[PDB]
Amino acid sequence: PPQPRKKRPEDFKFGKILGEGSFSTVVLARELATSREYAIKILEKRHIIKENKVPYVTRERDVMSRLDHPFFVKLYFTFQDDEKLYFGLSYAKNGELLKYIRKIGSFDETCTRFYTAEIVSALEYLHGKGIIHRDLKPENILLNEDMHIQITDFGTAKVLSPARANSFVGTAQYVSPELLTEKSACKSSDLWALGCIIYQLVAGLPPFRAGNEYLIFQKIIKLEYDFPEKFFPKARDLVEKLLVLDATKRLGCEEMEGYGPLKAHPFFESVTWENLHQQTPPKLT
Amino acid sequence: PPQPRKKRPEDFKFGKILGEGSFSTVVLARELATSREYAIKILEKRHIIKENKVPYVTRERDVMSRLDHPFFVKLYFTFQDDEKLYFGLSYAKNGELLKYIRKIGSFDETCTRFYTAEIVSALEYLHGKGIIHRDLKPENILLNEDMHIQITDFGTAKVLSPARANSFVGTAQYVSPELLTEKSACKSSDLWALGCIIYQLVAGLPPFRAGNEYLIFQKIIKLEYDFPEKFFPKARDLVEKLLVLDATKRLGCEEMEGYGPLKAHPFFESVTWENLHQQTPPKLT
Numbered sequence: 001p002p003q004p005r006k007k008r009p010e011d012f013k014f015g016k017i018l019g020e021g022s023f024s025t026v027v028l029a030r031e032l033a034t035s036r037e038y039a040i041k042i043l044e045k046r047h048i049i050k051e052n053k054v055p056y057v058t059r060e061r062d063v064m065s066r067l068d069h070p071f072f073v074k075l076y077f078t079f080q081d082d083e084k085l086y087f088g089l090s091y092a093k094n095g096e097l098l099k100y101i102r103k104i105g106s107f108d109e110t111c112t113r114f115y116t117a118e119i120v121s122a123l124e125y126l127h128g129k130g131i132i133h134r135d136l137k138p139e140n141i142l143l144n145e146d147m148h149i150q151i152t153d154f155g156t157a158k159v160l161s162p163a164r165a166n167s168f169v170g171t172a173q174y175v176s177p178e179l180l181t182e183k184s185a186c187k188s189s190d191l192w193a194l195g196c197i198i199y200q201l202v203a204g205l206p207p208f209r210a211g212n213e214y215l216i217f218q219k220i221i222k223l224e225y226d227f228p229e230k231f232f233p234k235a236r237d238l239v240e241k242l243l244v245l246d247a248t249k250r251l252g253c254e255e256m257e258g259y260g261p262l263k264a265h266p267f268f269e270s271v272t273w274e275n276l277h278q279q280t281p282p283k284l285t
Numbered sequence: 286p287p288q289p290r291k292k293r294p295e296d297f298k299f300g301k302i303l304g305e306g307s308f309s310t311v312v313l314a315r316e317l318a319t320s321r322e323y324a325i326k327i328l329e330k331r332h333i334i335k336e337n338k339v340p341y342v343t344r345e346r347d348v349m350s351r352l353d354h355p356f357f358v359k360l361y362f363t364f365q366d367d368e369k370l371y372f373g374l375s376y377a378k379n380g381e382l383l384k385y386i387r388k389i390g391s392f393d394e395t396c397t398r399f400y401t402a403e404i405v406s407a408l409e410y411l412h413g414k415g416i417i418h419r420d421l422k423p424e425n426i427l428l429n430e431d432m433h434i435q436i437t438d439f440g441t442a443k444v445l446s447p448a449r450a451n452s453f454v455g456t457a458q459y460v461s462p463e464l465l466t467e468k469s470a471c472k473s474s475d476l477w478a479l480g481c482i483i484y485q486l487v488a489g490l491p492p493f494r495a496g497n498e499y500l501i502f503q504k505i506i507k508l509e510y511d512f513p514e515k516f517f518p519k520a521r522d523l524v525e526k527l528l529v530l531d532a533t534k535r536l537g538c539e540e541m542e543g544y545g546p547l548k549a550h551p552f553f554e555s556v557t558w559e560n561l562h563q564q565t566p567p568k569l570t
């Protein structure tokens with residue numbers, strides 16, 4: 001079926017740089033014909049080819065095109081000129097979830113519960129499509145103008161077919177033990193990251209911290225971390241059921257019978273899971 | 286490039302009927318996996334085939350798929366089962382513009398100007414793609430939750446290639462004289478409808494009214510109508526430059542040098558055309 005004409009650089013008025021990565025730069029752009037604002041990720045083809053990143057850029061596009069859920073950054077269009085590729089993405093006006101963690105120090109119980117629930121809901125959708133994020137972190141969980149989450153950064157995701165993996169290792173503080181021991185990744189690897197994120201929301205800092213990566217990995221494989229006295233009891237119990245060395249024993253994984261038991265955890269008692277994105281997010285402190 | 290899986294009836298929880306047409310019924314539906322609300326237009330295949338409406342249903346889908354502008358109802362997806370076709374459309378929460386005309390009687394100058402400007406902007410986009418609506422009317426100009434317009438009903442549109450036409454005749458009160466005399470339609474036919482709509486917004490009733498269709502057509506070809514004393518002066522001048530029998534002399538048409546002169550009309554003096562959908566619509570009385 002016919003689709004709109006392929007867009008081009010001239011159709012936009014580019015503005016400020018929203019972010020810079022190793023193989024891309026995201027720029028805020030206003031489409032002239034509609035006045036719509038998009039976050040356009042620009043990637044130089046030559047650099048991508050030189051560093052053998054074609055599989056990653058291709059995967060990012062393919063995975064995003066398959067996602068159709070309110071808690072994920074949307075890919076509206078793509079186009080390219082002689083030197084660059086352009087991905088038209090939804091513009092998450094409020095930035096990274098990490099920004100708010102730093103801004104207010106830590107989230108109260110109500111805000112922790114709400115945002116954790118949205119992340120859990122997003123992961124259920126993602127995992128339901130046999131996709132592993134592999135680099136889930138506050139930096140990758142953006143916030144739209146209404147303060148609902150919008151997860152992004154899928155170039156390093158893993159699309160399951162069988163849960164084999166290997167090759168990529170996400171941000172050190174959120175790396176699961178299986179990636180360091182067996183060099184493998186599965187859906188449960190994301191649940192481990194979830195556990196670190198919940199801990200970070202409540203404590204204000206991720207569970208495993210150290211002077212360098214080697215030391216962080218060392219703490220991870222030994223499950224070396226502890227909870228501060230204040231930590232919300234039910235949240236602590238949940239984290240303990242997520243930060244489990246054995247990937248088959250993490251609440252939410254297939255061997256633990258899926259998302260049902262996870263969403264039924266006491267910490268989420270007052271959560272209505274059916275329409276989170278229609279709910280008004282609690283105000284951050 | 287991969288796309289989401291084809292949706293199906295079971296993916297939705299259908300609700301109330303939003304509207305009923307001769308070959309379709311629009312139903313409010315909530316997608317289970319996202320809690321998103323869509324207005325799903327359902328059309329029975331057998332009926333469509335019996336009445337030879339395949340060209341119309343096909344055109345509706347094709348035209349909508351080509352539109353990517355904030356002032357038009359969006360087509361998100363399509364699917365079908367053994368008996369029906371389903372079009373997933375954006376849900377215009379506030380209904381038809383006609384509803385508000387009846388609700389408050391008539392629009393003040395500020396509201397008339399704002400909504401007329403959005404319609405003009407929508408038509409510029411539509412015409413820029415060589416598409417003639419052919420049945421533009423308050424009933425076809427919906428309003429989203431933010432009170433910005435969303436034009437719909439494209440099955441009877443005409444996609445230009447050369448401005449030939451003929452075959453279909455829209456709602457009597459908005460029919461242009463060329464359709465009644467030469468049995469032809471062009472972009473300017475929509476501008477005539479625009480003139481009737483502006484008049485209706487200000488007067489509260491369309492320009493040409495009568496007991497039946499024959500009498501309405503009779504008044505149209507004779508340009509038989511008049512303005513009530515109150516009518517905003519500049520709005521009147523604009524309408525007089527739109528309701529012109531000769532289609533090549535309507536403000537906004539190609540022979541009159543396009544949308545530039547139309548948007549520059551005195552009635553729109555204080556209008557900023559670049560970002561109308563980013564502006565807060567004036568409150569209706």
Ligand SMILES: Nc1ncnc2c1ncn2[C@@H]1O[C@H](COP(=O)(O)OP(=O)(O)OP(=O)(O)O)[C@@H](O)[C@H]1O
Nearest residue numbers: 018019020021022024025026039073089090091092
């Ligand atoms: N859709 C978006 N809306 C608003 N901001 C965004 C969006 N996408 C990305 N950003 C911002 O731009 C930054 C850079 O994104 P990009 O994908 O180009 O590199 P990165 O993934 O952050 O780093 P790298 O790819 O090297 O790991 C992000 O960290 C984020 O702050």
Ligand SMILES: Nc1ncnc2c1ncn2[C@@H]1O[C@H](COP(=O)(O)OP(=O)(O)OP(=O)(O)O)[C@@H](O)[C@H]1O
Nearest residue numbers: 303304305306307309310311324358374375376377
């Ligand atoms: N996207 C939408 N969102 C909300 N309401 C809608 C939407 N589309 C249509 N409607 C409502 O449903 C009604 C019926 O639409 P439909 O296209 O099924 O028939 P119609 O075009 O109104 O009549 P006919 O096709 O016989 O001329 C519309 O008049 C409008 O009131």
